[PDB]
């Protein structure tokens, strides 16, 4: 891992939200930053709350 930008991981199921491509799976358009997403975003792999995604931006 190595990198910094709007890619979030859900803790819980491990899931990745990708902003270059947009929530597809949930509903949404490519190049939205997981900052858009309501707070009522749920994510589309385990259902889990938008609380439960975290960013990845960290470079060892
Ligand atoms: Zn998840």
Same mark, same amino acid.
């Given at each position: 891992?190595? /990198?910094?930008? $709007?890619?979030?991981?859900?803790?819980?199921?491990?899931?990745?939200?990708? *902003?270059?491509?947009?929530?597809?799976?949930?509903? /949404?358009?490519? $190049?939205?930053?997981?900052?858009?997403?309501?707070?009522?975003?749920?994510? *589309?792999?385990?259902?889990?709350?938008?609380?439960?995604?975290?960013?990845?931006?960290?470079?060892?």
């Amino acid at each position: 891992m190595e /990198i910094d930008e $709007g890619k979030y991981e859900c803790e819980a199921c491990g899931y990745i939200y990708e *902003p270059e491509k947009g929530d597809k799976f949930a509903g /949404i358009p490519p $190049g939205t930053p997981f900052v858009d997403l309501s707070d009522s975003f749920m994510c *589309p792999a385990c259902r889990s709350p938008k609380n439960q995604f975290k960013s990845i931006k960290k470079v060892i």
